[PDB]
Symmetry: C3
Subunit: 666 residues, 3 copies
């Protein structure tokens, strides 16, 4: 019988067990770790962990089902190359946000900084939203973002501009925007006599002049409906301009009312930081306090390599003011893309190792926002993955994913250009024990690396905690080839299956749940993205406004009454000019024409018609105007050129001309 002491070789006992028990039996490992020289049939175990050295000298751990209370979700399913949640996820007012970049490749081609969100603790995710448009100077350059977070109720992001040609960083800008909120407040609105502004007391409001604010039930004259911030007095007070004034003071003290805000109706504040010296990528975000935050960076283009952070001490009054802080020099080589977070006055930083044959990921902590550090190296050259994390109690809980299977270990060569099943791991480190020598990396889920191109969208994720759950949002692929080597060298997402990378989220229980389950099986028709309802006439009806930007082929089209109290049907053409034309017919090009009709049918009987004949028509470029009156209003009827064309012909005579005077002939 197996020892389950993490040290005794339990392989033979486990094998005998499996051989002697029915395949449907769930073998309970009783929470113990079993050392093995080959992984057994993990699927037949519950509540079991294995230790196994795939590479000798490098134990890793492997969780059976139910060993951790956790579950994997797929959270996007879009034809874009959807990857790089690194390192942008946050939770705000009970909503989990998973920002990422949707592109067509490792680079900024077709790229939109995007997010999906969950409003039910990760069970279900929203339709992707684009946070950036294509850059004005596309396709020379386009946007990129690996650092985003919330500070005092505003979203802040480091929006980079990079070249499509080489992914070269070209500009850094801090973009920020107020988060949408509803506030249910008591008192705090005053309006002084004989002037028109009302001051609103909303602690840490985070709003700027011009930001959207909506008022309900204010009980203060003129403070009502959709308004904007007029001035900001200080961090806890702003004003709005009302339409009117009164001869006495107003104060809604004791009255309950509602505010307020909108990310979508407020402009971005964009602060141009230029091409910050010695920076390759800005990555990760750590709210420090009420006034500011840090963002991670590295420089890995020229020697010497740098890794550190930029601290923005007062991002509200002074968004252009940052200070560079670097980790100790011995930890900078072969390092990039640090993840940073801040808890109880301690800034934590974990690097990505860039190669399996040199010292890799290292962990650092600072009590002075990066001026000085205490450092440790993870054993065995952890590389190719970022290590996003959160702190739960004493423990840093960190997640990482190999990019392709069997790359995780020190000395393991890259193994690309073939389909494989990369491992995703997590580990816990107690900050009061500050040593990683005996760190246990636990493989909790396996992803797919498609193999059709060298690049991998797997991993490079982001971590958040909400209530008693920790969430790791990260990329994963599937076996559908993007056909880069194939018929889609242009990487068009909308051909065949597009790009296999999509986002996943591992949700792991981190503390007790003192409620009955909120879990459901999703059995609805997903009806948010293209909301469809069968109308009372049995026809699929979409009431949402929509934009189709791709080429559209339509069959029979009816344009319904829609406009000016539904008196008219309307089509509006944009651009410099509109073109309505006629293709060359496949079968009978000799019939090429368009009929325009004021009535319901092709017969001239139903209404006046103008028929424009094609150049391929038997009657090449003929126009026939067919009506019971032809009335030319507002201008003379003239030939385009002078003395070149006629009225009538010998075989097409007008009966006469009704004139107010004799012809003027010259």
């Amino acid at each position: 019988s197996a020892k389950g002491d993490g040290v005794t070789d339990d392989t033979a006992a486990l094998t005998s067990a499996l051989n002697d028990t029915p395949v449907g039996q769930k073998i309970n490992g009783n929470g113990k770790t079993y050392k093995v020289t080959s992984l057994p049939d993990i699927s037949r175990f519950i509540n079991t962990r294995f230790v196994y050295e795939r590479i000798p000298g490098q134990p890793l751990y492997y969780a059976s089902e139910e060993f951790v209370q956790g579950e994997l979700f797929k959270i996007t399913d879009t034809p874009y190359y959807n990857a790089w949640p690194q390192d942008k996820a946050f939770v705000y007012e009970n909503v989990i946000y998973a920002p990422y970049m949707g592109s067509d490749r490792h680079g900024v081609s077709r790229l939109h900084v995007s997010w999906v969100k969950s409003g039910d603790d990760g069970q279900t995710w929203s339709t992707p939203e684009w946070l950036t448009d294509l850059h004005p100077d596309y396709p020379t350059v386009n946007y990129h973002c690996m650092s985003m977070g919330v500070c005092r109720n505003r979203l802040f992001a480091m929006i980079e501009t990079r070249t499509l040609a080489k992914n070269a960083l070209t500009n850094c800008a801090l973009w920020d925007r107020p988060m949408s909120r509803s506030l249910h407040l008591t008192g705090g609105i005053t309006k002084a006599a004989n002037q028109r502004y009302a001051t609103i007391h909303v602690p840490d409001h985070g709003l700027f002049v011009g930001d959207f604010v909506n008022f309900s039930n204010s009980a203060v004259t003129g403070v009502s409906g959709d308004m904007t911030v007029a001035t900001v007095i200080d961090k806890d007070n702003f004003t709005v301009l009302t339409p009117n004034q009164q001869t006495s003071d107003l104060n809604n003290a004791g009255k309950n009312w509602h505010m307020g805000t909108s990310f979508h109706k407020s402009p971005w504040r964009k602060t141009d930081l230029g091409l910050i010296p010695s920076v390759t990528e800005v990555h990760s975000f750590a709210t420090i306090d009420n006034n500011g935050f840090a963002m991670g960076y590295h420089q890995g283009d020229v020697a010497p390599r740098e890794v550190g952070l930029f601290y923005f001490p007062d991002a509200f009054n002074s968004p252009s003011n940052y200070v560079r802080r670097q980790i100790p020099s011995e930890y900078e080589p072969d390092a990039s893309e640090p993840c940073i977070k801040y808890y109880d006055g301690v800034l934590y930083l974990i690097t990505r190792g860039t190669r399996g044959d040199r010292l890799g990921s290292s962990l650092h902590r600072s009590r002075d926002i990066g001026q000085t550090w205490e450092s440790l190296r993870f054993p065995h050259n952890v590389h190719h993955t970022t290590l996003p994390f959160a702190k739960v109690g004493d423990d840093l809980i960190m997640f990482g994913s190999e990019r392709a299977e069997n790359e995780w270990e020190a000395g393991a060569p890259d193994d690309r250009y073939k389909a494989s099943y990369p491992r995703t791991f997590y580990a816990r480190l107690n900050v009061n024990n500050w040593n990683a020598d005996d760190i246990e990396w636990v493989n909790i889920t396996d992803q797919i690396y498609q193999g059709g191109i060298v690049n991998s969208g797997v991993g490079v994720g982001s971590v958040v905690v909400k209530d008693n759950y920790i969430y790791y949002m990260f990329g994963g692929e599937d076996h559908f080839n993007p056909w880069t080597y194939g018929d889609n060298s242009a990487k068009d997402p909308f051909k065949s299956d597009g790009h296999p990378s999509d986002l996943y989220c591992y949700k792991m229980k981190i503390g007790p749940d003192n409620r009955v389950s909120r879990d459901f099986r999703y059995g609805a028709v997903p009806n948010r993205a293209v909301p469809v309802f069968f109308d009372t006439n049995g026809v699929r009806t979409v009431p949402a406004p929509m934009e189709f930007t791709g080429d559209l082929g339509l069959g029979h089209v009816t344009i319904r009454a829609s406009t000016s109290s539904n008196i008219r049907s309307e089509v509006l053409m944009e651009g410099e000019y509109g073109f309505i034309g006629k293709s060359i017919p496949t079968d009978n090009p000799a019939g090429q024409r368009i009929i325009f009709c004021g009535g319901e049918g092709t017969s001239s009987t139903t209404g006046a018609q103008i028929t424009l004949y094609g150049a391929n028509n038997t009657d090449s470029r003929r126009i026939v105007y067919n009506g019971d009156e032809h009335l030319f209003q507002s201008a003379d009827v003239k030939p385009y050129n002078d003395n070149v064309t006629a009225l009538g012909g010998p075989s097409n005579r007008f009966t006469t001309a009704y004139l107010g005077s004799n012809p003027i002939v010259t």
Copy 2:
């Protein structure tokens, strides 16, 4: 160790057990009930029930996973405010129907009475269907329905009209329609010689004159394909009028044939009941027998309240005849929205309580459809929820949901304007014992209350049994704010995440299942709402007819051959008139124009053209007609005005005019 006797405090023993076992171990409670003074980590238990008095004196019960054989499903996912299954669910011919109202608020604004259906015992649900259109007098009033069901193969619904301004009842009408069914019958069609009617014998057909009937394999001349009911003879016999008559008697006895009904192709029968006096809402539906049914109602706008039912003894012959029967007067205060059902000669009624600090929900039974009652009060002022129920064996099985967390108990204050996790409960009551003093409310699932507005869509559901499962259909929210206080005070569903309320269904095992599992994981692309197929050219193709009623922006548009053996492409414009126009260009307004062309390109080389120049064009309001022939058919070429415009001009002379006689000058 823990006693699991439901009385002994098992808190400490349960904690010791949890501290001493691995988190992944499923602690089996052996179906026992354990009294606790605080709820433990419920997620680590299976087959365990806890009794806990959150409010002392008020024990409630909390089920771990697997204690009940049950599962929660999400069944709608639409941007409308989808709530109020109350109390309309029914099953008909193996299909489960979950009707509800999809609006934008607690009111009739933007409201359609809707349903979703399941054809696989609750695993998957259909695309929402709208049962009502917006009222003709929208937006002054609109429809509303909380009472719907089936009697003798017809759907009956009380369709109310209510004001948008105050949700005030304006009109009640009974609307009914035949349900669609296929019947496989032998014999029963006869056709007398020398006349055109055929009599069809279909037991309890439930059809009226004008209702749709389809015939197959009848073996009776003229009885074939899509037909309508010409006359109804009695409840078991009707006629159709055929095209022809014959000199011999037809009788299809012994022959197998098929019919033939349609909900969609049959008109509603609408019986205007006016503003039924002393009614606030009609709610719930109890089929009594082959002739009629009852509907619940209450009046709660003014004192004194009424709560009771309307019995329609013969809804087929006499839909406008009903009798009102009130519950006993002591049970009417603070009561509303009765759920009613009829089983084996007994009418059961359960009220909603309106106040946590006043006597609440009560249960009533009657053996003469509400003339006499036996009554019972639920302990502890059950309130804010309806209690839809079914009877299974000797038990009433009833379900209820608090609307926001911690509101269930007697004396518990409403707690709105903050996100929470409301509890959903069920209870059994033995009808022979007829005593609710020791009722056991079992919390089986928790929902979300969003908190952005005071109203909640959670709960207020409906219950049905199918085979050995009971189904509770009800509302639940998520954490996505509707931004009512924010940028969407207008409550437009199609902005942002729309409204968080959608429908769920709790599916509970109620009897033995003597079959292997039917369950599946859904892994398909949902392809019913907008059916897409990648065509042989690799382009997404939708073959279903579709209506887009929201504003549409399109890119490049090709209208394909579709009409009259696909000889033509066709666009029809509706309304009083059509308008095809040109926006003011952003960059080059001086270029504003539309080119209409009978050929494929902007060059006049490809076909005849007419170009209409915009007012912003350099050549303001110019028209150029460009063809190799300009032929004016059916009418004189005339100026709009008299002696106002000329033919040609001094720099644009016509070479000559070809006339049949000299000009008439005057």
Copy 3:
């Protein structure tokens, strides 16, 4: 206490255990088989198999949850009649393919040979793709396919033509196409001096002249991007024509490069086999080697009935050459639709039985590709189902489904025209023991047969193995009636719920899994079929090209700038001719008209206008041309007819005519 020995009646012991245990307890049967005289509550058991004789003398076996490691998936959800995976499934480069036919009935009306695919080992499935268009001579005939598979990197399929009227076979053609793949190669491209072709060494490329090939990093001038096969030298070598020639030899020996194939960009090779004599259906596909394959067939229309295979020894050089092989004459009566697979030099064939009262399905093996056979009959007349299978170690693993509930057994009458729950079975047969007398059919899942028509889409599936899992893909219905007998006798898929048949997949573990779980819960918005993204302005945006072929009703339409560096918006009309017309107004027919405008509004102030009046207008068939200039270019302004219409009129006089010469009056 139950014996669990497969023979002793355990009914009473099992009833006693069930009565004595809480309902939530999972009763562990320890992988034993329990004999019962009635099936108990199977849902309360885990790891339990029952033996039960529903018909005396015909024991079948019934699996509780967890007895087999397996899961049912739903893999299509489309309004088409989706059925008949038989017998076409295959795996290729890690992608599981599930081809089927999507039609409107048992027959070829509306039919497209289709597939869905899985890129994650069956968890999630692709948007349906159509492999065939409607036949050129539709609706007289249409395509059909029940035999498809892969041989040397090419998809081969027997594409049949059948009448709509009777489903009578009209023609057989072998269609083949290269499969899409990306190849990562070293060396193998040479280009001799002074000529334009490069020869490409790709072992077993399976390409033909004109097939698509894409090249990356070749290091050989002109071998770049999208190309086509110019000549095939032999099975391992082909040439491509480049744009240019060099004066020295090029050879990329030692260099790493990539190719480059495409199913979609390569034409089918279609080999007309005519009307193959004595064939009802070609069904199933077995790859034999590098050169060819076999396809099953039967003939069941006239005597003698046949069952066998057609072996294509060299389908690459000689696709029109095949040899007919029949199974032994005693097994041919009452048999059809053979499933065939080839393993380690042995060809296996399993028939479908046509009736339950005659000897049914039989199994055959051949070591000479069907010339001689060893055979065995399955006990109890297995009928109505095909028995697709795979070989895993020493076992054939086969799957089958009764078409409606209780049809499986010998002597069981067809039970149609009522809803039921048909059982799906699998069984193992050890090929060494080669004896089926005690074969164990194990019921592992139940489907739905809708009952609205006599036909069933349930079952008739297909089987593949990928890694350590076997996959059975097959049909199932739901309770939603197609209303064939009802308002949809035309069987239009896009009315109501369309057709209830859709595809499912039972994924069963067949070997050890030495990886941690890949399983995820799908929580994403499905965003492949109609990819929607919320744009930065908050509006749903679909960037994919799309075709809408069903009738479309649109509301307000804007055609945005799309064409020629977005200078213009563009509408192209196809067909012989285009028609833009105006329906008769509902409320004001007297206003019927269309306004065409070069500017943004109805006011002629915004732009030049032409208004075509409807015949129903007060100004019937009037045309008003309203511009500040009317210029007729390229042609005379003429009347259509000679000497019939005038210029001007007595109340509409032109002021004068400006001419270069006097009118020519004649």
